[PDB]
């Protein structure tokens, strides 16, 4: 069977939506109901990873920009980055480790743990208009819990 994907949007537990901050960055802010179309639409693929009832291995891409979210060690820091890919080759079932996130549902909210960096999560700051980043905890002050809205397809 070939790789399957669904279109969706993310909203953190504090109701912040995700938008393009630049060509290779995402930021999080509260959008008015009329500005919702500025939010990024992700192509979420169900990829190869650890067989778990809790963790669902996924890859998150931005189809129109040929980008995938990826986790890389930048100098001494595990870092969330947007990486360009060849759309003729991606998505695929066997996504390289840097592209894999373990999607975990907890109290009806979603967390996205980096497979490359266990215990590191897709995170937002409590402050407005700050970049989306990789955070070293699902706890503390930063936000790691989201809701997903699927887009008609």
């Amino acid at each position: 069977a070939p790789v399957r994907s669904l279109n969706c949007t993310l909203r953190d537990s504090q109701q912040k939506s995700l938008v393009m901050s630049g060509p290779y960055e995402l930021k999080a802010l509260h959008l008015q109901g009329q500005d919702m179309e500025q939010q990024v639409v992700f192509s979420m693929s169900f990829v190869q990873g650890e067989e778990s009832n809790d963790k669902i291995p996924v890859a998150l891409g931005l189809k129109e920009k040929n980008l995938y979210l990826s986790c890389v060690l930048k100098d001494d820091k595990p870092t969330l980055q947007l990486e360009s890919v060849d759309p003729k080759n991606y998505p695929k079932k066997k996504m390289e480790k840097r592209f894999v996130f373990n999607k975990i549902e907890i109290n009806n909210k979603l967390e996205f743990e980096s497979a490359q960096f266990p215990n590191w999560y897709i995170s937002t700051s409590q402050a407005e208009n700050m970049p989306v980043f990789l955070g070293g905890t699902k706890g503390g002050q930063d936000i790691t819990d989201f809701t997903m809205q699927f887009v008609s397809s």
Binding site: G61, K88, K92, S153
Partner: peptide, 14 residues
Amino acid sequence: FWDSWGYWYGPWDC
């Protein structure tokens, strides 16, 4: 391509 249930199968450029 989009199947009858709304899943996109294969790469972005099939």
